[PDB]
C-alpha cells in the first residue's frame, strides 16, 4: 500500500516493474482496479492531470477532482489536514499538485492509510514525468545505458530535471545540463551531470536534449534579461535543428522561447510521444501502488 | 550564604593562567581565596571531587522570546537552560515582540531575569527602529538601560551606512556591534545553497551573503574605529575574511554557533528541519575550517544562538522556522572537540568564559579574587540524553534530540548561590 | 419529490428515518438511484463537496459539478434562474452552496421540480452538517437526550451552529455556546442554548464541545484582537486536554487557533469521525429525498 | 514589622458604617482589631491624636508618564506624590509611550511599581491598539497580566461599534472600560466653547461633545450588559444623562476632578495654559451642578485625572498640552466640599476609598479585619501652600499652585508600613 513521492525512492527494480506494466498498457492490456482517487491539483495542469484521470479511469478507478483555490485550503485547512480528510473520505489514492516543496514527507506518508502521488510539488519532483521521459528515451533507443541526456534550460527550478536525472543515472545513462549560468544550481553535480556553458557543444554531445521551460511562476526575481535572447542562446532554432539528433519537452511548450514554432512536431521530436506516454506510464503507477 | 567552599575539583582558571587541585572559598558571593585544603568554620561544602572547577559560562548569542514569543521559550525557561548548561551570564537577543528598541522593553527582560534569579541576563538593543533596516535605534537610552551591544539578529542590515551609522555611535558609547551576517538578496531561500539544496529543490542562502557582509563589516569597523563582532560564522571564506581583519589590528570579534561544528547540510535531510538555520548548516570543507579557525584562535568564542521554535513550526523544510536550541548542548558539544584532540580543556574553557566575556566587555567569566562568585563544575565524560526527562527547553529543535551526549554540568554557581544541580 | 434547505423543517420522524438509513449505509448498505445531481458551489468546499459527490457516486447517481465563478452567474444569471437551468436540463438533485442566507426558500423551493439540498448558504443552513453532527454524538453515546452540548467560537457567523442545535433540541439535548461575546446572537437563546463567558467552566460542564471556525470570510468587521489570544482564550490547548471529556469540529480545523496542533486526532477527538459519517450521512439525505 | 498601633485618632470606615475614636492593631500587614485602647508587647505606635484616620485613598485616574514621558513624571514621582496625597492606591492610564497595549508594558509598570514600594499602582489597557481606535485591544491578555480596566484616555473612541466590541469583551472579563469622553469632531479645539473661547478666539470644545459619548456609553452599557465609568464628568447636561442610566439599572459610573469643582473656564484668564485641560474647565452653572452631583450621589468617586506637563508645555494655551496635577491637592480641594457644609466627612472619604474600590472591583478602601493594612491620617484643618518646597511632582501645572491649601495629610501607611508622615 505505498506512495510515490520522489524518484530517488524508486530502486531499480521497481522502476523495471513499473516500466513493464507501462509497456503491457500501452500495447492494449486491460485492467480493473476497484478504487477510488481524488486528484488534488493547486497549480495549473493540462497533461498531468487528464493523463492520470484518464489513466484512472479506464482502469476503472473512481476520480475525483479538486482545485486548491475551491478547496477547503482557501480556510486555512493544511495540507496534512486535507488528505487526512481524504482518508476519512475513503479515497484510496490521492494524486497531487502543490506549489510548494514536500520535504520531508516520509512520516506523513507513513502516517496516511493513503497511496499518494505526486503529481508535482513546488521545484521539487515529478516522478511521473520522469518515468514518463525514461520510458520515451528508452522506447525510442532501447536502452538508456550510455546514453548522453541533454536538459536545457531552467535547471534550478525543475521538478522534471529532478525527477529524470536520477532515473537514468541510475540506469547508466550520462546526464548533461546546459542553460543560463544564474539557473544550474552550483551543486549540479550531485546529480553526477556535465555542464555544458554552451548550448551548441551540448547539442553535439547529447543523443537526445530534452528543452525544459523557464519556471516564470516560480522564479523569486529576474534570472534573464529577456525571452528573445534566451531562444537564441539556448533555444531548438532552426539553426540548431539540422544538429540537433533528437528531443523532447515534458510541456507546455513555449513556442520561440524553448523551441522554434515550426519544430515542435517534427520526425526528430518526441514530445508528442510524451504526451502518450503518460497515460500508459500513469496506469503503471496506480497498478504499481495497488498494495 | 555568608561563606561557601568548593572542595577537591580541578580548577581551570584561564584568565589568571591558574589551574591545579585548589578548594575555592566564597564570601558574600564573591571569590575570597584560591587554595589547598581550605577549612572554615560553619561553611557550606559542595564537594567538587573528580569534576572540573571553572569561572560560570558567557553565552553572547541567546533568543528567550521574551517577550512574545513565550510558547517557543521565556526568560525562565532559557534561564533554567542555561543554568543547566553551565551558564551563569547569557546575552539575550532583540528580536523579541515588542523588539528591544526601547527602554520598557529592556527593564522589563532585567526586572523579570531579576525576578527569575538564576543566571545574569543581559540584553541587547536593535540596531534599527523596530529592526525594520531603515532608522538608527536610540542607542544612547538603550545603553543606558542596560543594553551592552546592538544588533538586528536575526535581520542582516542591508544598507551600508546605516551599518556604518551604528558602528559610529556605538563605539563613541562604548559598546560593540553584534552583526547577523546575510545579505537578503542572496540569502532569502531556506537552506544552504549546495548539494542538499541542489537535490530537493529547496530555495537557498548563499555564503556569499554571509562572506559579504562580514568583509563589509571589517572595513566598517576599520574605518570608523568600532567593534563588529560577527555572529555565527559558517564558512571557510568567512573565517579568512575575519583573521585578514584581525591581523590588521581591526576590532572584529566572532563567534561559532556548535552546531556548525557537529552538523553539514546533510543534516536536512536526517533531522529535516530541525536542521533549518540562519545561516545554514554549509559543506564539509566548512565544518572542518571552523574546526581549524577554533584550533588557530579565529574563532574567539563559542555561542549557541539558542533559537528555540516550536514543532508546529519545524515540520516542512519550506515553512519551518530557522533556529536550533543549543544551551543545554554547548558543552558536550565542544568538548568534543577536546575529546578529539583539537582543543585543550583550558582552550575549551576560554571560549566560554574569558573569551566572551571580553567581547561584551564585562569584568566575568573569571575566578580573580574579589570578583562574582559565577562558577561552573562538570563532568567531562558524563553520558547523557537529550530528551523529555531532560530538556529544560520548552521546545525541543534540535538535531541532537534524543541522542547520547558526552559532558555535563554538574553544578552552576552564581554569586555563591547554587542556582543548578545535577 | 422534495428538498432540505433547513434542520427547523425535520420533524422528529424524518430525522429518525434520515439516521436509519444513514447508520445502514455506514453498515455496507448498498441502493441504486437513477438519477442525476448537480453540485454547484460558489463558496470553496472540501469534504462537504466530495462528500456529496462520492455518496451520489455510490448510490449509482451521475455527479455535475459547477464552481459559481465559471459558470453564468458570472453573466448576471441569478440564483433562481441557475436552478431553472438546471430544472430545464433534467437535473433529479441540486446540491448547492452560495454566499448568502437563501431566505426566504418555501416558495422558490415549491416552484422548481427539483429536489434541492443545501449546502450551506451564507450564515443560515448546513443542513446535513447538523445531521453529521448529531448522527456522531449519537453512534458515540447512544442518545442524545440530556446531553450537555457546548459550541465553541464564531456562533453568530455559524450556519453549522444552526443546523446542528434544533436537530439536537427537539431529541432532548441541552446546548451551550461560549466565544468572543461580540460573536453571540443577543438572541441566542431563540436555541434554548446556555452562554458561558468562560470556555473552562464551559468545557467542565460539556459531554461533547463542538470548536467551530471562526468565519473570517463573512466577517463585515474585526471581532477580535487577535488569533493567538483568541487560542488562548477559546481554543483546545494542551492544558484544557486534560479537561476536555470529547469533542468535535466540522472542518477545516485552524490549527493553534481552534485546537492545538497536536490535538486534532486524540482518542477524545471525534473529528475524523465526522468526517467518515458525512458519506453515510450524505446518502441517506439523497435517498430520504428520493420522493 | 509583625505589629502596629494607631492610637487615638478618629477612625471613620464607611464600609462598615463604622466610626468614633478607636485605636487600630495591625498584623503582617493587614487588619487585626479596631477597638478603644489596644494595648499590645513590642508594638510599633504612631500617634493620631487629634487626626481623623480612614482606609487609604484610592486614585482611579492616574497619568504617571511611565514609561516615555518621565521628564514630566515617573512612576517614583508619581507614587511620592500620591502617598503624600493620601493614596495607597493609583489606576495608571495607559496613554504612555509606548502606550499600555501589550503585557510588556504592563509587566514593566508592576516591575517598577514593586521596586519604587510606595503605593499600590493597578495598570490599566487601551481599548484600542495603540489607542488608534481602530481596532479592540487583547484584552484578554491585558487583564491576565493585571490590567484593571480598559480606557483610551486622552482618546475618546469614535466609532460606535468599536465601543460597544470593547464593552462586550470587557464585560465577558469582568472588567469596566473607563471611557475619556469627548467626540472629536466636537472637541478639536483648547478650552470650553464659553465665555472665555468667544472672548478671546481660542478653539473650542463643545460640551456636546462630551454629552453625546456619554449617552452613547450609558447606551451601550445598557445593551451590553458591561460597565461603563465615565472619567471627568463636567457638565450639567452630562450628569443628567448619568441619572438618567442609572436610573434604569445600568452599571454606569462616573467621577469628577476636584478641579472642576474649584475652577470655571475663566481660570483659563488667571492661570493661561494651567488651566488648559480635557474635558475644559466649564460654566458656573457646570461647576455648581458637579458640586451637586456630589451631594446628591450622582458623581461617584473623586479621581484627579493627576495629568502632569512641563512649564515649556503650559506657555501659550494654544500649544499647551492639556492637563492638571492633582494628586497632592485632591484631599484640602475635597474637603472645601466639607467646610462650605455640603457633603460630610464620611461622604468625602467615601468617595475617595470605597466607592472607587467598588468600581475597578478591588477589595480596598476598607478596614474591614483581615484586608491590607492601607489607612490614611489626615488633618482636615492643616494649612500648606503647594509650592517647591513641598511639590513631589516632577511637574507644577496646576491654578492652586503656590495658594494656600487647608487639609493635610500626616501619615500614609501601606501593608502597615509607614510609607509617607509630613
Ligand atoms: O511545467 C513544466 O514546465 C514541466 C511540467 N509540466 C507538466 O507536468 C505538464 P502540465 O502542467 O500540463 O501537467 C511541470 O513541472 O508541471
Ligand atoms: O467552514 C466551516 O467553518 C464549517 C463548515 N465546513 C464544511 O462544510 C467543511 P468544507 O468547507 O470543507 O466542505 C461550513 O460552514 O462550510
Ligand atoms: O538569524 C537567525 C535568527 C534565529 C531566530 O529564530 O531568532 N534563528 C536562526 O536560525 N537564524
Ligand atoms: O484627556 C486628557 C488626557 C490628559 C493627559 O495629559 O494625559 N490631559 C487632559 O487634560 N485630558
Ligand atoms: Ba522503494
Ligand atoms: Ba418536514
Ligand atoms: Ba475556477
Ligand atoms: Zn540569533
Ligand atoms: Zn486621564
Do not use: A, G, R
Given at each position: 500500500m505505498r506512495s510515490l513521492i520522489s524518484s530517488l525512492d524508486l530502486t531499480r527494480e521497481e522502476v523495471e516493474e513499473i516500466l513493464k506494466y507501462a509497456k503491457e498498457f500501452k500495447e492494449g492490456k486491460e485492467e480493473t482496479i476497484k478504487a477510488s482517487a481524488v486528484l488534488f491539483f493547486s497549480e495549473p495542469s493540462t497533461r498531468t492531470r487528464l493523463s492520470f484521470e484518464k489513466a484512472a479511469r479506464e482502469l476503472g478507478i473512481e476520480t475525483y477532482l479538486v482545485s486548491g483555490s475551491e478547496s477547503s485550503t482557501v480556510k486555512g485547512e493544511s495540507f496534512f489536514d486535507t488528505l487526512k480528510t481524504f482518508e476519512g473520505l475513503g479515497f484510496d489514492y490521492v494524486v497531487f499538485r502543490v506549489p510548494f516543496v514536500f520535504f520531508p514527507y516520509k512520516e506523513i506518508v507513513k502516517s496516511l492509510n493513503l497511496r499518494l502521488v505526486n503529481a508535482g510539488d513546488g521545484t521539487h519532483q515529478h516522478p511521473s514525468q520522469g518515468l514518463i521521459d525514461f520510458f520515451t528515451i528508452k522506447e525510442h533507443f532501447g536502452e538508456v545505458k550510455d546514453l548522453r541526456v541533454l536538459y536545457v534550460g531552467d535547471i534550478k527550478h525543475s521538478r522534471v530535471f529532478r525527477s529524470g536525472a536520477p532515473l537514468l543515472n541510475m540506469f547508466g545513462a550520462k546526464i548533461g545540463v546546459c542553460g543560463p549560468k544564474t539557473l544550474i544550481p552550483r551543486d549540479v553535480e550531485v546529480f553526477k551531470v556535465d555542464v555544458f556553458d554552451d548550448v551548441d557543444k551540448g547539442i553535439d554531445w547529447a543523443d537526445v536534449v530534452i528543452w525544459l521551460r523557464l519556471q516564470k511562476e516560480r522564479?523569486?526575481?529576474?534570472?534573464?534579461?529577456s525571452e528573445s535572447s534566451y531562444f537564441k542562446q539556448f533555444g531548438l532554432t532552426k539553426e540548431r535543428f539540422e544538429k540537433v539528433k533528437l528531443y523532447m519537452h515534458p510541456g507546455p511548450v513555449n513556442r520561440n522561447v524553448?523551441?522554434?514554432?515550426?519544430?515542435?512536431?517534427?520526425?526528430?521530436?518526441?514530445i508528442q510521444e510524451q504526451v502518450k506516454n503518460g497515460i500508459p506510464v500513469r496506469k503503471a503507477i496506480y497498478k504499481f501502488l495497488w498494495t | 550564604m555568608l561563606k561557601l567552599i568548593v572542595k577537591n575539583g580541578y580548577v581551570i582558571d584561564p584568565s589568571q593562567n591558574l589551574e591545579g587541585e585548589f578548594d575555592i572559598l566564597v564570601e558574600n558571593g564573591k571569590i575570597k581565596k584560591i587554595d589547598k585544603n581550605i577549612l572554615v568554620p560553619e561553611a557550606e561544602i559542595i564537594d567538587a571531587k573528580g569534576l572540573i572547577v571553572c569561572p560560570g559560562f558567557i553565552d553572547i548569542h541567546v533568543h528567550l522570546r521574551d517577550p512574545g514569543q513565550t510558547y517557543k521559550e521565556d526568560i525562565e525557561s532559557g534561564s533554567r537552560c542555561a543554568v543547566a548548561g553551565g551558564f551563569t551570564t547569557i546575552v539575550c537577543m532583540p528580536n523579541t515582540n515588542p523588539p528591544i528598541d526601547n527602554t520598557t522593553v529592556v527593564n522589563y527582560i532585567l526586572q523579570k531575569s531579576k525576578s527569575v534569579g538564576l543566571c545574569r541576563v543581559l540584553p541587547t538593543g536593535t540596531i534599527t527602529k523596530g529592526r525594520k533596516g531603515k532608522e538608527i535605534a536610540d542607542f544612547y537610552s538603550l545603553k543606558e538601560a542596560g543594553c551592552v551591544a546592538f544588533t538586528d539578529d536575526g535581520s542582516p542590515v542591508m544598507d551600508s551606512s546605516v551599518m556604518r551609522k551604528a558602528l559610529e555611535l556605538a563605539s563613541q558609547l562604548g559598546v560593540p556591534i553584534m552583526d547577523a551576517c546575510e545579505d537578503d538578496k542572496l540569502a532569502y531561500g531556506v537552506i544552504n545553497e549546495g548539494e542538499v539544496s541542489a537535490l530537493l529543490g529547496l530555495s537557498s542562502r548563499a555564503p556569499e551573503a554571509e562572506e559579504i557582509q562580514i568583509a563589509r563589516d571589517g572595513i566598517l569597523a576599520q574605518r570608523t574605529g568600532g567593534h563588529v563582532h560577527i555572529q555565527a560564522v559558517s564558512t571557510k571564506l568567512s573565517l579568512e575574511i575575519i583573521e585578514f581583519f584581525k591581523e590588521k589590528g581591526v576590532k572584529i570579534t566572532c563567534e561559532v554557533n556548535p552546531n556548525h561544528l557537529l552538523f553539514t547540510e546533510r543534516e536536512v535531510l536526517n533531522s529535516g528541519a530541525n536542521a533549518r538555520v540562519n545561516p545554514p548548516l554549509r559543506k564539509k570543507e566548512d565544518r572542518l575550517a571552523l574546526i581549524e579557525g577554533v584550533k588557530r584562535g579565529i574563532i574567539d568564542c563559542f555561542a549557541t544562538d539558542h533559537a528555540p521554535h516550536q514543532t508546529f513550526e519545524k515540520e516542512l523544510v519550506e515553512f519551518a522556522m530557522p533556529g536550533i536550541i543549543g544551551l543545554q548542548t554547548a558543552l558536550p558539544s565542544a568538548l568534543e572537540l577536546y575529546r578529539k584532540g583539537i582543543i585543550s580543556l583550558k582552550k575549551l574553557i576560554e571560549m566560554f568564559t574569558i573569551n566572551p566575556a571580553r567581547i561584551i566587555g564585562v569584568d566575568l567569566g573569571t575566578l580573580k579574587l574579589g570578583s562574582p562568585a559565577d562558577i561552573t563544575i562538570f563532568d567531562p565524560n558524563k553520558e547523557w540524553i537529550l530528551n523529555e526527562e531532560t530538556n529544560l527547553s520548552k521546545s525541543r529543535n534540535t538535531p541532537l534530540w534524543g541522542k547520547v551526549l558526552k559532558g555535563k554540568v554538574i553544578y552552576t554557581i552564581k554569586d555563591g548561590k547554587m542556582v543548578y544541580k545535577d
Open positions: 522564479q523569486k526575481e529576474n534570472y534573464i534579461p524553448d523551441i522554434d514554432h515550426e519544430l515542435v512536431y517534427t520526425e526528430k521530436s518526441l | -
